[PDB]
Scaffold this active site. Structure first.
Site: not given
Ligand SMILES: Nc1ncnc2c1ncn2[C@@H]1O[C@H](COP(=O)(O)OP(=O)(O)O)[C@@H](O)[C@H]1O
Lengths: 290, 225, 62
Positions: A15, A116
Site C-alpha cells: 500500500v 512488467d
Molecule cells: N507513484 C505512484 N503514484 C500514484 N499511485 C501509485 C504510484 N505507484 C503506484 N501507485 C499505485 O500502486 C499500485 C501498484 O501496485 P502493484 O499491484 O504492485 O503494481 P502491478 O499491478 O504492476 O503489479 C497501483 O494501484 C498504483 O495506482
C-alpha cells in the site's frame, strides 16, 4: 523522507503512501523473511538514473518494513480510459512513444529486463514526461545457460513466446508490450483481451496471425503449436479498416514492433531511429492531460 | 559505469579505504582484517561446498566483505553472518533455493539465516547488484581473437579459463574490487601470461590512451601480489 | 535538428563472425534455445560492451 499523508492502493502486497512530491512505497514484511519481489525491485531501480525511469531519493529502513520513494501523479491507464478525445495522432502519439522507448532502451543497455510493462506501470509527471517504473518482476539478463521463469508479464501485454512457453528468453519481450502500448494509445481500447485463461493465444492468433513454419522457425518446439490450426496474417488492407487513425510510417514500425518473430523483432536501438519521428509534425511535451 | 551502484558509493581509493577501516575501528584493530579474510575464506569454501555457481560465490564474498566494512567483528559476530550472505546472494540473482532446503543443506535451523538479514541490508545500504570480472573474462575471451590472429586460442583455451577464474576468486578474497573496475582486474589477472597476449592486445587497440592503462594494470598487479 | 536518444551511442566495434566460443556457439545449435529469440550477436554485444564498462582511474574518485 519521513513525511506521510493519505494512502493509495487496496492491494495486500503493498500500500503506497504519499508526501514530500514523493510517494512512500511500503512492503509488508510480516515463510521467507523478505520476498523475491522486494529486493528484486530495489536492486535494479537503485542503479538507474534517467528522465524516463524514476529514482530513489532515500531507501531508509522502517521498523519492520522497507520504504521506497515514487512519483506523485497518476498513470497512462487513466489517461486512455477516460477522456473526451483530447489525444490526436499528429503529436500526442509520438512524444509518449518516444519517451517510453527511451526508458526501455535505458533499461536494455543496462542489461535489465523489466518484464512488467502496463499503462498502469507507465506513469506521467507534472512536466508530462512519462516514466517507466514498478520493477517488480525485473531481472538482469543472465548467462545464456540459466533457466528463467515463465509467467512474468501480464495477460493483455504478453509476448507470444511467453504464450508458447519460452523458458529462457531474450529481452525482446518488452518491445512487444510497448507496441501494444502504441496500439492501445492510438485505438483508445484495451488491445487484445483474454478471458482469464489460455484464450490470449487464440485472440493473438485471431488478431495478428498464427505463425507459419516458413517464417518464424522453431515455433513447433513448445508442445503448444500442435494444439491449434493456422490463421491468416493481416495484409495491408488494415491501413484503412480498424486502423484508420494512423499515418504511413506508424504502421511500419508498428508491424516491426508487433513481429511475432523475436529474433527479427526490432530492438530499441533501431526503434529510436526508425524514420517515424522524422516525419512531420514534431512532437512537444505540453499535452492537455489533467 | 558511473551511474552504477558500485561506482558512486562503494568504489574507493587507498587513503579513503584505509580511512574507512580506521573509522569502523574507531566508531566500534589489525586482527579484524585478517579475521574477516579468514572468515571470507570460510564462506568461500562453504559456498563452493554446497554446489553453487561462481557468480553467486563472488556476490556472497562481496556481501560479506561489504558488511564488515561498515561494522566490526565484535559487535556483530562473524560466525553467524557467513550463512546469511549465501542466502541473500542466492535470493539476490535468482539462485532459488528455499529457506528450509537451504537450512537442511547447511548447519542452520531456519532462525540463524534470517535474524541477521535486515541489519545486513542496512549496513550494506542496498547496493545489492554487483559487477564482477567474469563477464569481462567472457568479453576478453573474445576480443583477443578479434584483433589478433597470429598466436590465438590454443593455449588461451588450454590454460586460461581454468586459471584466471581461480585467480579472480583469490582476488575477491583479497582487497582489489574496491580499487579498480572489473575489466581492469580482469586485465591484471591476464598478465600472468604477458609474453605475447596483453602487450600485443593493448598496443593495437589504442579515445583511451594505452600507457596510462598499462600503468593502472601494473599497479593493480602490484596490489594483488 | 533532433536526436532520438540524447546520449546513448558507444563508439567501439564488433565482429561476430570471427569467434570460436565453446559456450554459446555450441549452445545455439540446440532446438529450444533458438525458439526463444536467442542469437549469437546479442549475447556477444551484451558481454563485450560489459567488458569495456568503466575504463577510468582512481584519480576520478574525489
Ligand atoms: N507513484 C505512484 N503514484 C500514484 N499511485 C501509485 C504510484 N505507484 C503506484 N501507485 C499505485 O500502486 C499500485 C501498484 O501496485 P502493484 O499491484 O504492485 O503494481 P502491478 O499491478 O504492476 O503489479 C497501483 O494501484 C498504483 O495506482
Amino acid at each position: 523522507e519521513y513525511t506521510k499523508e493519505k494512502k493509495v492502493g487496496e492491494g495486500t502486497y503493498a500500500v503506497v503512501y504519499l508526501g514530500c512530491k514523493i510517494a512512500i512505497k511500503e512492503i509488508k514484511t510480516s515463510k521467507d523473511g523478505l520476498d523475491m519481489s522486494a529486493i528484486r525491485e530495489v536492486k535494479y531501480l537503485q542503479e538507474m538514473q534517467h528522465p524516463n525511469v524514476i529514482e530513489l531519493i532515500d531507501i531508509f529502513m522502517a521498523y519492520d518494513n522497507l520504504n521506497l520513494v515514487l512519483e506523485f501523479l497518476p498513470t497512462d491507464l487513466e489517461v486512455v480510459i477516460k477522456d473526451k478525445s483530447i489525444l490526436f495522432t499528429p503529436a500526442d502519439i509520438k512524444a509518449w512513444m518516444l519517451m517510453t522507448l527511451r526508458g526501455v532502451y535505458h533499461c536494455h543497455r543496462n542489461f535489465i529486463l523489466h518484464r512488467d510493462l502496463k499503462p498502469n506501470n507507465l506513469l506521467f509527471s507534472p512536466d508530462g514526461q512519462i516514466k517507466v517504473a514498478d520493477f517488480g518482476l525485473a531481472r538482469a539478463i543472465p548467462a545464456p545457460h540459466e533457466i528463467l521463469t515463465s509467467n512474468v508479464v501480464t495477460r493483455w501485454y504478453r509476448a507470444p513466446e511467453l504464450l508458447f512457453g519460452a523458458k529462457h528468453y531474450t529481452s525482446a519481450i518488452d518491445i512487444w508490450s510497448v507496441g501494444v502500448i502504441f496500439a492501445e494509445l492510438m485505438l483508445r481500447i484495451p488491445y487484445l483481451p483474454g478471458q482469464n485463461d489460455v484464450d490470449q493465444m487464440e485472440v493473438t492468433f485471431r488478431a495478428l496471425g498464427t505463425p507459419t513454419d516458413r517464417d518464424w522457425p522453431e515455433v513447433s518446439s513448445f508442445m503448444t503449436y500442435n494444439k491449434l490450426q493456422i490463421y491468416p496474417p493481416p495484409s495491408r488492407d488494415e491501413l484503412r479498416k480498424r486502423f484508420i487513425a494512423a499515418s504511413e510510417y506508424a504502421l511500419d514500425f508498428m508491424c516491426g514492433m508487433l513481429t511475432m518473430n523475436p529474433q527479427k523483432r526490432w530492438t530499441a536501438v533501431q526503434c529510436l531511429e526508425s524514420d517515424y519521428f522524422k516525419e512531420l509534425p514534431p512532437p512537444s511535451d505540453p499535452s492537455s492531460i489533467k | 559505469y558511473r551511474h552504477s551502484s558500485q561506482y558512486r558509493m562503494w568504489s574507493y581509493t587507498k587513503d579513503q579505504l584505509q580511512e574507512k577501516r580506521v573509522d569502523t575501528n574507531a566508531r566500534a584493530m589489525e586482527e579484524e582484517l585478517d579475521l574477516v579474510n579468514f572468515y571470507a575464506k570460510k564462506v568461500q569454501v562453504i559456498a563452493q561446498h554446497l554446489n553453487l555457481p561462481t557468480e553467486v560465490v563472488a556476490t556472497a564474498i562481496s556481501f560479506f566483505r561489504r558488511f564488515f566494512l561498515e561494522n566490526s567483528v565484535m559487535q556483530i559476530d562473524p560466525k553467524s553472518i557467513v550463512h546469511t550472505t549465501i542466502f541473500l546472494a542466492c535470493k539476490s540473482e535468482n539462485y532459488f533455493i528455499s529457506v528450509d532446503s537451504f537450512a537442511q543443506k547447511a548447519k542452520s535451523t531456519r532462525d540463524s539465516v534470517l535474524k541477521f538479514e535486515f541489519k545486513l541490508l542496512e549496513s550494506l545500504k542496498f547496493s545489492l547488484l554487483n559487477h564482477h570480472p567474469y563477464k569481462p573474462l567472457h568479453g576478453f575471451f573474445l576480443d583477443i581473437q578479434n584483433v589478433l590472429y597470429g598466436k590465438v586460442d590454443l593455449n588461451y583455451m588450454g590454460q586460461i579459463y581454468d586459471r584466471c577464474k581461480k585467480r579472480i576468486t583469490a582476488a575477491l578474497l583479497t582487497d582489489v574490487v574496491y580499487f579498480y573496475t572489473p575489466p581492469q582486474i580482469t586485465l591484471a589477472t591476464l598478465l600472468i601470461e604477458d609474453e605475447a597476449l596483453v602487450t600485443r592486445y593493448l598496443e593495437t587497440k589504442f579515445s583511451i590512451d594505452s600507457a596510462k592503462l598499462l600503468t593502472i594494470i601494473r599497479e593493480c598487479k602490484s596490489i594483488i601480489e | 535538428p533532433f536526436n532520438g536518444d540524447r546520449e546513448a551511442h558507444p563508439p567501439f566495434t564488433l565482429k561476430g563472425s570471427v569467434y570460436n566460443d565453446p559456450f554459446i556457439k555450441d549452445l545455439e545449435h540446440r532446438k529450444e534455445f533458438i525458439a526463444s529469440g536467442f542469437n549469437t550477436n546479442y549475447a556477444y554485444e551484451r558481454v563485450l560492451t560489459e567488458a569495456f564498462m568503466g575504463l577510468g582511474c582512481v584519480i576520478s574518485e574525489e
